[PDB]
RNA sequence: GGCGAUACCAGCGAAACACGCCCUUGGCAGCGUC
């Protein structure tokens, strides 16, 4: 029933400029406060900014005042936070939430979107390469054989990495990134399978990137 | 700012076990103060409203308190699906203010990893790099050497490591190790190992591939 | 323990402020004093 729905997030240069929006459903914003919240990679949950109800009173933590805003439109169930002045550390997942009913649970945060991410960089976007990591034992051998794929040199965050379209899950680790000394990103995504599929069985790891439109699939074979 | 200083800052609990989650804010907050659960990759959902009452639908297992400006966070006993960082929130004054998050995971026996190595792709060594890939797969705890060896020679400052977050079914973990070297680098060895030391192996576990043979 | 003057928390309206209603009672806590 109740939904938020967090749109706008993107890649913007350092002094840059975004407007994301928090669209609501099954629920009126207009008898609610409406809070802003970010998260930077793998760190925690920091409060932004907040407006109330009726009166559509504004409030700010200090390290955004004065250059992000926080405004809702009743007429549209939507709530919107303009950041101006970005910077590198503003770089974040952002989530709105619904502070529920004061008789129902306080000044709780009943619900929450699920978040839009900004990324705030001087680097520009780039396209993964795709190299198989090839299987680790013969077809032969009567056990487990580890394959996979490494998918290096993207920018920004994130790409999304699957096996044979999604039909393979089961024991894959599809590794959090790690920036490389140029400023950019690479992972590995492994599989183990039983080494008697090799070669009965087609591995392909399907990769994508939409931030700069890229889709690679690749086979990867016995060597 | 009203700070809250949230204790421990990460927990490995086995199930069944009680875990106690402590904030304490640095003035007065009233009963103003929420807890929150949120798993890895998915947003955070409400436990705990105005310090002691228990949100709609959440198990009875969770229950908080509130001793002046301390304010407690207990599971009564840990169920596997518990596993997520928890966040005390204070709505007493704007600004309002998070603590920094309790990372609690799973405690479980000892697992050693399994160990495999990758050589580099023909297609990537043409490009001009050569990255060799090992990987420890399901081992517990998350503590683990890596140590990479080119023709015998200890290796240093030119890998890097990635592990994942606990496996909700098998409470380990995995991590890849990542050698890069230049085309011409990689061409003038022919050794390539990776050593793993491990608390579940009774001594170092070595893979390694001959270049070219 | 008594007395005195206070300082803050609070009911409801979809509600931290603002706006409307209700209320003159409760509650911790310090101070002053015997
Ligand atoms: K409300
Ligand atoms: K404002």
């Known amino acids: 029933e109740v939904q938020l729905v967090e749109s706008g997030g993107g890649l913007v240069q350092p002094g840059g400029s975004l407007r994301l929006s928090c669209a609501a459903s099954?629920?009126?914003?207009?008898?609610?406060?409406i809070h802003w919240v970010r998260q930077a990679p793998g760190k925690g949950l920091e409060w932004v900014a907040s407006?109330?109800?009726?009166?559509?009173?504004?409030y700010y933590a200090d390290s955004v005042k004065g250059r992000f805003t926080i405004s809702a439109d009743t007429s549209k169930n939507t709530a919107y936070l303009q950041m101006n002045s970005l910077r590198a550390e503003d770089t974040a997942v952002y989530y709105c939430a619904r502070q529920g009913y004061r008789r129902r649970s306080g000044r709780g945060f009943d619900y929450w979107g699920q978040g839009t991410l900004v990324t705030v960089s001087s680097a520009s976007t780039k396209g993964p390469s795709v190299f198989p990591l090839a299987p680790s034992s013969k077809s032969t051998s009567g056990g487990t054989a580890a394959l996979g794929c490494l998918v290096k040199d993207y920018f920004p965050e994130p790409v999304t990495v699957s096996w044979n379209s999604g039909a393979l899950t089961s024991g894959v680790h599809t590794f959090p990134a790690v920036l490389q000394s140029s400023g950019l990103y690479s992972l590995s995504s492994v599989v183990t399978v039983p080494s008697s599929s090799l070669g009965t069985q087609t591995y392909i790891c399907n990769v994508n990137h939409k931030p700069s439109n890229t889709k690679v699939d690749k086979k990867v074979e016995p060597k | 700012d009203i700070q809250m200083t949230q204790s421990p800052s990460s927990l490995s609990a086995s199930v069944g076990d009680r875990v106690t989650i402590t904030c304490r804010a640095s003035?007065?907050?009233?009963?103003?103060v929420a807890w929150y659960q949120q798993k890895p990759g998915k947003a955070p959902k409400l436990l705990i409203y105005?310090?002691?009452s228990l949100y709609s639908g959440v198990p009875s297992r969770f229950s908080g308190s509130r001793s002046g400006t301390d304010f407690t966070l207990t599971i009564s006993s840990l169920q596997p699906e518990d596993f997520a960082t928890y966040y005390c929130q204070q709505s007493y004054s704007f600004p309002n203010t998070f603590g920094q998050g309790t990372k609690v995971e799973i405690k479980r026996t000892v697992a050693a990893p399994s160990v495999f190595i990758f050589p580099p792709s023909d297609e990537q060594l043409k490009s001009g790099t050569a990255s060799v890939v090992c990987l420890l797969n399901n081992f517990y705890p998350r503590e683990a050497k890596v140590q990479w060896k080119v023709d015998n020679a200890l290796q240093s400052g030119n890998s890097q490591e990635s592990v994942t977050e606990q496996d909700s079914k098998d409470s380990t973990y995995s991590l890849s190790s990542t050698l890069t070297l230049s085309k011409a680098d990689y061409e003038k060895h022919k050794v390539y190992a990776c050593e793993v030391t491990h608390q579940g192996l009774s001594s170092p576990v070595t893979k390694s591939f001959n270049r070219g043979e």
């Open positions: 099954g629920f009126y914003i207009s008898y609610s406060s």
């Open positions: 003035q007065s907050v009233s009963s103003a």
């Open positions: 105005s310090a002691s």
């Open positions: 407006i109330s109800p009726y009166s559509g009173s504004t």
